[PDB]
Amino acid sequence: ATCDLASGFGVGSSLCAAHCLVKGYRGGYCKNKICHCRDKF
Incomplete structure (x- = not known):
């Protein structure tokens, strides 16, 4: 899962962003x- 708890002292926004940057x-x-x-181009 993208979101969790140990998501770098968060939830999973940074990953979500970077991970989605790959897609577009x-x-x-x-x-x-x-x-x-x-923002999907």
């Missing part, structure tokens, strides 16, 4: 324990 997003943030990406 310009941002990523974990909300409601779910990786929600933003």
